[PDB]
Subunit: 355 residues, 4 copies
């Protein structure tokens, strides 16, 4: 609610082309298709092939920024990006070679930031996952067997075995309800009463395990990435040691592209930012274009009012952001700093129209 | 648990009439219907048409309160509120013109406060949503394909393609279980074992993303709306800077209409309020009708007892509210203020029966 | 994890008999039943009828503890507990009179503490619920209509109307998958892709609303019920104002019945309690039976060891409880109090075997 | 995200063999199976029988570490581990004796740490569970009956009774959708509208109850297990009383086996550890193998850089771990301690290459 994320966060065309590229699979897969567009899209694979392949050798030129890097991951597919289709072209002379369109599916995961963020925490908590997972396996065959107890007589063809009941186990326990083979008798129907009650407690915990400290990591991700952009501010020599830990939980940084709007005039004032790199378009009669290491909105927070400038991104600005309360926290945290935001709440009233 | 929300929070008849209005759709949609009430309700559209249309021009008189306003949203439908049915009346000479009863469906969302509260936070966290959404797309075709591997031989008509398996993908992954086309073999049935385990982890995270900082916003909404109603209290010059940030998390403000009851006598005392605007009905032999900037319940909290007055809303009062602990926090937070709540715990014992 | 709840929390036989009582419904409901046990259980209604009716008049003697009470709730069913069956006996001369066995179903909710705890918070947050509920209604007909767009031609009999699609709406959106009427075409099948994605976000929020501050109330319930049992401890005159608010979040109180076990000897020491009312069975050669306002386990916490006594409930003790950390919080919170728990960690070593 | 869990957390072969052992069930359960491998796996039971039985008597030698122990749990199955199959071998002369392969299913739960962690908290909160559980039973028959109201006429064979509707109750309320017997009329179909809305609120709370303080316990489990490994550090005499309670929430301890890698050189520096027992492989020209009571990474945190050593586990090290922020918390928490981490940030620069 307090951040301006822009400048094509879904930027690189590498990540893009799997989306169109894989949809070209389908028409090959389907009878009653004229051969015209059958192969027209086979090129389009050869395009993205050629295109990543065009990208490829430039990537293998890893002499750019070659100081200290661990690029086993980013290359791990680029290799197979182009070979697996290729040998597929020959040894699978039949059209099925296209079925190696499962292969690009890591290309998003090549440049998927937020995926290593996933895998990072699985390696702390999987202790639980297993003890749950086993326990999921506990409750499975604990219960799956209890049907084999019963309907083997009148439902051999459906419940004449164990795994056929393990089939009906997780279909039942995992909230689903397919609806192919269901009991008939009383007691076998009784047993269901704890099942949903159970499984929704199980995943009641287990999927809960995921978000549990995942959010910590993401709520940590916004710190670790933002103990940066701290000392840049010329004013933060006087902030206290413990003061920051409160703050930076909320402060998210994002970039804005050139030309974009930052805050429009006349809209109600709700938030202030800290500029740390770039330049702005403070639309006043004399544009107060503030450079790296600036801020604005105290005019809008201390008074509780609409905006004093249609501020727009003159350049690609790496922005911070902060709503009122946690700025009221700051002005409450120290009378030292509210002095200059009191002064600046008078200076920028005339510095805006003047130079 | 600590708030008195009243005075028709679902107030305006603009938001209302879509509810009855759209149900008039149905009878047109149905064979074997006499033409009598077929058209009787077509008027009822023409009513709400005429009614919003009656409202309309008065809304286009935006010379009321015309100081600084951004009403592109609120008008955005009022325009189409009345035209879209109208041109529909002619060009769609057939009865299908009523099918533009999808159009009013934003009229609730016209005056739906709490909906911009939704959209505010989507523009901070959608970075995640996409990386999840892609990742949802990752796992989809990662898995959907694995059925095309198998049942193309004996289930052409069901699993003779890719998208037919992508159909069975999200039906399966999204907790559902339609129950039309299900595998037969072993290994194809094996693959399900991670699916529900997966998707309930996925939405285990993803829908979790929604409530995650949404609650922050709503838990923030109760601050931002309530850094107001602070300085009104004549006693809050001595409260500390950091003191407030703790408090206002809990303090919710709501309005009560005239005539309503606020706290009934004899019921156990559990909460105290801060009056800031309006007047009350403190039912005593001499009603101590306290105006803006008042409170009551310390008689009920410091002793731990039932109520001393059937306090009722003599007028439309904008109320605050506060349970004990966080008032015990306050009396614990400072011996300065408990003095006057000690005194007031004696004054109001006799001021209640006296004047 | 830190509480000993015992003494028949599901105590009163009033709440009990609905459970057996209502199961007597069934056999009446079923063809091919001999008349023998048909009516044998009709008495059993007449029993619980007579039994609550026996209870009844004693309840109408509300001259016990008649100081200040609001018993409109508790009586609200006892009235209808016995009349509704009665007039049902005559006017419904046919056996269907038993179908007023929906009536006792509030009798649990008569003495269901934890149910008013539910209703308390619905009256704060229903502002959201409605704006969601409407929004649920928004998305419903927003989408339900989109099927009427399509399959009216080849599925008149299933999708030849609006509500038949609203039927398939919430079946689909609410995670279910009945599996009666499903589309056939492409685009109508496309639309599902956001649905589960949506509804699991919707209830992703909405059911989240319930637990959201519900837990606050229950986490508050353990305070409000436990600002009691504070001043009873003779040692809590020196605890700081803010000190308590941290603590009492964790401290839950429960009662134990006479004869029961409290902590068994030899088991690892993990928790200590504060006795405030009753007496114990500290099994030592000289039983140190401590009365109201006592504690034990510092021998087990300061050393990090197993138990020094098979302490058992000599009487009905209202207990508190506290694990280590939050007691380590206390010994960390003040060197003042650890002195006497240092001394008591020597006194009780010999006071246990001595008198 | 901040822990290195290794050394076969799924270690003991006791817990293992149920997994293979129980899968041998299946082939016995299936017609059209040659008798060859029918019995080959019956030995494999006799193996694990013999194997646990081999383990058994060594376990009954509970003269190892026999100081104070409560091993009623761990033995509780080892008894039945071997008898229940045995008497099953004779009295169940028919092959069904194998159906006592439900019996080992506690053997994982024998050595399942994290399962007593489950049961610990159920004995605090089941007060709620019941009041919910009853309330689940409230809403069940509250609603299940409402179908018997209706479809008894035209659906005797499906809805000609109560429990047949209670069948359709929880199938419906518990998010499932089997899809066998569904209404036809209007009003009976209306009633569903609150059901999913309800049940997802119910489990909206109820399964929420599980994770609610479960996470407290697990977030407590990482304290209680880690008030240990505190005084071992020679430097923690000066840390404040309240200082620790913040810290140890985050500090998780895990063990690493000999030979494993701890932090690889060149990777970006993100975390530091506290060694408390064992030895390391700090790969430098002169390996600075630090023993119990050591740490490393301040070189990587104070500068914000990659790693200075491919530190690898020379021995089985019981490790702690700590990311930056909470170490920035520490260096912020006291200028006293940052002095020696300033000095050590110079000493280890040359102590690494020197001895
Ligand atoms: K389902
Ligand atoms: K189904």
């Amino acid at each position: 609610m307090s951040v301006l994320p822009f400048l094509r966060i879904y930027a690189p065309l590498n990540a893009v082309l799997a989306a169109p590229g894989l949809l070209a699979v389908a028409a090959l897969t389907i009878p009653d298709m004229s051969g015209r567009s059958r192969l027209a899209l086979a090129a389009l694979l050869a395009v993205i092939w050629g295109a990543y392949l065009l990208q490829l050798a430039a990537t293998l030129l890893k002499r750019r920024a070659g100081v200290v890097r661990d690029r086993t991951p980013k290359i791990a597919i680029d290799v197979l990006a182009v070979l697996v289709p290729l040998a597929a072209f020959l040894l699978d002379g039949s059209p099925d070679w296209s079925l190696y369109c499962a292969v690009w599916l890591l290309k998003p995961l090549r440049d998927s930031t937020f995926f290593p963020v996933l895998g990072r925490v699985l390696a702390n908590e999987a202790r639980n996952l297993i003890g749950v997972t086993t326990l999921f396996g506990v409750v499975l065959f604990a219960v799956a067997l209890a049907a084999y107890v019963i309907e083997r007589d009148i439902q051999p063809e459906k419940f004449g075995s164990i795994p056929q009941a393990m089939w009906w186990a997780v279909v039942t326990l995992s909230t689903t309800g397919y609806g192919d083979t269901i009991p008939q008798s009383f007691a076998g129907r009784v047993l269901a009463g704890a099942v949903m009650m159970s499984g929704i407690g199980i995943f009641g915990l287990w999927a809960g395990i995921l978000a549990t400290g995942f959010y910590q990591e993401v709520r940590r991700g916004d710190f670790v990435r933002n103990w940066q952009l701290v000392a840049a501010v010329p004013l933060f020599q006087k902030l206290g040691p413990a003061v920051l830990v409160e703050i930076v939980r909320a402060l998210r940084a994002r970039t804005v592209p050139a030309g974009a709007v930052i805050c429009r005039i006349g809209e109600p004032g709700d938030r202030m930012f800290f500029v740390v790199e770039g330049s702005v378009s403070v639309a006043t009669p004399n544009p107060v274009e503030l450079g790296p290491g600036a801020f604005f909105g105290e005019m809008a927070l201390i008074s509780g009012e609409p905006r004093s400038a249609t501020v727009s991104a003159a350049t690609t600005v790496s922005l911070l952001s902060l709503h009122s309360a946690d700025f009221q926290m700051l002005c409450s945290s120290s009378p030292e700093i509210a002095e200059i935001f009191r002064k600046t709440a008078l200076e920028r009233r005339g510095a805006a129209a003047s130079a």
